[model samples]
Target: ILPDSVDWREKGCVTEVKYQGSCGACWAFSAVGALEAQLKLKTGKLVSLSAQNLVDCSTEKYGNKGCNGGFMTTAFQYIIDNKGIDSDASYPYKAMDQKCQYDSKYRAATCSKYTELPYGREDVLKEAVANKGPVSVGVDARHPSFFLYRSGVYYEPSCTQNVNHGVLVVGYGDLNGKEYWLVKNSWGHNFGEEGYIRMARNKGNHCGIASFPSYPEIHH
Candidate 1:
């Protein structure tokens, strides 16, 4: 059974939201976000990783477009194969695309394994998050209102499942009678609720959030 309330932020697993700027690197953010949580779950650490590393290095191998769009699945596979990624402090975030700088000395953490949840399986997604930790999710966050969402549960019945953006699903809960997933966005703190969005959950896999959920198993 699902908890009445589940907020990874409260559990110290979730990290602060980072801005993606004009880059279509949300997939990298989601990948790093979920891994940050997983690192905490397994090692009690919350070191931010370089999304730019993914943007520049993983594109050719993972089929990701640096600023155009990408997939969490391919990103995760890249992380696993690469041995590990560097920390944000070492690599940092520029909010813009550039060349890869994967220095071995700057490497912060490594992913031992990863798993993808069943497509459109909300129940499975819930279980993975409840037991495994935060999950990387794809969402159709193309709505203009999505940019101005300040608070409250977001239930976009007509939201497309084209899955244009990638984000992190930290947890889930209810607001009034509407169920929502606590999502961490990458559009900076000025956007949404301090760079986070409450998305409609358990509504026919709203925007295909459940369709492409994943998490990494990192070494401490």
Candidate 2:
């Protein structure tokens, strides 16, 4: 069941916050973030999946330019197609566009399939989280203020469907009477509230967050 004050990071389902530098690879980071949460929730074992594996190998099939940008839906498809991906220890992150080292020997985690939530349906997103796990969602992180956001619930007045960045919604809660979504970002632990952002929840799908929520079904 979902809670009025849910925080996955505190619950250990969420992994350590990561930094993607200037690669525009938030999509990859968010994808891996959701995968990590799913793996942990399903198996009680937390493993750091390789973002470089997705960034390097998913482009050819996923159609998103490596480092430049990508989509979470395509990322999931790539995982299903490739059978699985390796942990960060075997295939570490370089944070740049690179050649794909398609070696299954390093594979450590996998997704049997993925499911998508309807656009603008925040309730659908909440339901997904309550039943499944963290979800990979897109957002408008194009503004500079987004880079400087710190504590407190964050809400952008003009956030829209121009979603240029991806993030994970690990949980949701009400802060000071305001509903917010606990988002896991890839900008590093130095950014936001220890690398996580509390986005406006039930507020017209702020930043098109509810536009494309997807989570993978990891193999157990």
Candidate 3:
């Protein structure tokens, strides 16, 4: 299920964290989802940053009615514009709450906005990878199998259901002699072959993953 274009050596490896059942927090997941990769690339340390931090802190722009779905790009843009903030060691993960505490000292920087290019996402991904980090993507993962994907072998659902969930494209490479994209999910470490799944790259629907790049500097 790994993609052929992935160069395993350059693939970003990030620490996996559990998102509990907070389907509404996809925006937060998407925000930290890309940040996790950026942190790894920037510091060479793959640490599990806080989705809770984003959910609680990134109000006004990114944080929606708590856990409810929002635009992934908006969240990333908020972080870039606000100077960014650190994950909450002070506030732990709470899957069902919507309260956020703001800290000015740990603000993240603001970034530029990008137009959606679902078809040209691969190029966007390449830019992010070459620039060192992962990219935020939106995928149609509303298959019955995807909904029932607790643990075990997952088969693509018969119907292409549209579920707007956020994920990180950590790295791409060949595995099991087949080309695959290494993706990290926030559904915890025990889900999907230990919080990871491989899908064929550049093959239409399987590769329909959309990317949203943070602003300030465009990756040539």
Candidate 4:
């Protein structure tokens, strides 16, 4: 059953805001964030998975482009195939492309599989976040409002289907009579709602909030 509102941060499943730096590795961070939430939900332990692991390793075979942007699903696949991924503290983040240095001993979390939600289905996304933990999503962030986002429910009438930026959908709820998808960004805490954004939901998938929603599947 889905609740009226869900905030993984309040539930201690989400991690602190992280900066992706100048790297176009938002896809990696988004995937890592979802995996971190899943591991937390299942093990009663919170661990920050390494975005740099995906950035460096998922490139050669998993279809990811390193710091040149990539798909979150492919990042998940890399984790599955690699048997596990390293912790952020151990692998750390360099925000730049480097050779894969994956050590099996450093493996922190393992994902069995991943699922992508139906495009434009905010309801499905809300349910996913409620039951499965955080979800990775790609959105049309070309609009200036997205970069300048600070507070309130964000909706851009000019938002397009040209997806570019990737983020994690941590929860959903209504605010000021407007329903919203509580999203986590990789642009650092100084940006939008302390590294978060309340994107307008059920508004025709504004900014393509539900366009590319996905989450890694982890089990106990």
Candidate 5:
């Protein structure tokens, strides 16, 4: 059953918005955001996982290109294979590619697996976010209007299906009759709505949001 509105922030499952700087590390931030929420749900405590850990260590073996760019699915796989991810406090972000400094001793959370929703399936994506937790999704964020979006149900007809930017779907709600997905961006606390955006939902998958929706599966 899907509710009319769902917000993980109100439930204390979401961490403070972060900035990805000039790095194309949005993928790592998105994946880490989802894992942080899942970790909170499982342990009743919120922990800020390190995106730098993935950026540095997830390359080569996992195919993540660090600051250049990466995919959320591969980031999740990297965490699963690494057994755990470090906290942001220990492995702070530098927004630049650097040597792998992953230390298991500083590991803060672990996830067993991850699930990727089918492409163009907003219904399924909504179900996962509503019942499971925040979801990692890719969007066509090349438009200047998208980057400057302040508030409202963002629906740019010109927004293509060429997904490029990675962000987290933290919740969804309706403003009047218009529905929007509450998305958390990694471009700093000053971007969008205090580092968040309400992307138009159920509108033919605007920005190809449903194309690569994914989330971590945590246990223990």
Candidate 6:
């Protein structure tokens, strides 16, 4: 069960997406994860962007190798530098390996810049949340439940392990009359209360939700 203070309602909209599983594509997931939130804020539309698009296309000299792990900042940089492609009907989802087919018509503007920081970055996250909308983070969620988090209430087991998982910080507020940060996950709609989760405010080292900035800026 989640902490007493956190609430799902009023914090952010509960959303979900098909992650495709164990793809080592956290960078792509994280990049599009934040983009999905930005899209919701801008258009009031909660559409799922193509993770495969990022995986196949965002190889723009950022030291990223899809399905092999990379930084989200680099993926952001790729979008900006190369001008991202949209995940519309044109760019359909391909769950498994496929050839990269770069589409020139659906590209979006690249991000301006990225911010980087070290571990134990709760303050950094708070600053970003206050200034920007949400921030992407990496964490050590090496629990068996995480791997098999199909549905229902998630409980922490006695033995915890560290594994990399990507999530988005939508906002911070009082939930159940307690303060917490509203976070979004990409484990599909069936998992984690329809693709969203909450963590204790200012609490770290619990779920591997460590925050960091790792994207590049597009120069106009």
For lDDT, the strongest prediction is: 5
Model 5 misplaced regions, further than 4 Å: none
For each candidate in turn, the TM-score is: 0.94, 0.95, 0.73, 0.97, 0.98, 0.73
Q: List candidate 6 stretches off by more than 4 Å.
A: 1-16, 39-47, 147-163, 174-179, 214-220
**Candidate 5: tens digits of C-alpha lDDT, residues 43-119:** 99998999999999999777779999999999999899889999999999999999999999999999899998999
> What's model 2's overall lDDT?
0.86
- Tens digits of lDDT, candidate 3, 61-157: 6545456666666666666665664554544568665566656654332234433444445655655544545666666666656555553223353
* RMSD in Å for model 2: 1.4
Clash number for each model: 0, 0, 23, 0, 0, 11
Root-mean-square deviation per candidate: 1.5, 1.4, 4.5, 1.0, 0.7, 5.0
Give a tens-digit lDDT track for model 6, residues 1-220. 2223322234342245555575777667777766655555555566666677777777546786777767787777766666664663566655444567767676533356666656657666566565555667775556666556543333354322254766676666665554556666766666565666555555543465544544233344
Instruction: Write the number of the candidate with greater TM-score, choosing between 4 and 6.
Output: 4
Error of 2 at 149 (Å): 0.5
Ranking, lDDT, top scorer first: 5, 4, 2, 1, 6, 3
**Top-TM-score candidate index:** 5
Give the least accurate 10-residue stretch of model 4, judged by summed lDDT: 60-69
Candidate 6's error at 39, in angstroms?
Answer: 4.9
lDDT of each: 0.83, 0.86, 0.55, 0.91, 0.93, 0.59
Worst 10 residues of 2 by lDDT: 1-10
lDDT of 1 by residue, 1-220 (tens): 6687688998898777788887788998999898888777777777888888888788777888887878887887887888888888888877666798888798867788889888899888888877888899988888777777898977666687788888998888889888888889998889788888888877888877888888888654
lDDT of model 2, residue 34: 87
In model 4, state the lDDT of residue 47: 90
Candidate 2 lDDT tens digits, 109-168: 789889988888998899887778899999988777788899898888867778888999
Rank the models by TM-score, top first.
5, 4, 2, 1, 3, 6
Query: Model 1, stretches more than 4 Å misplaced?
Result: none
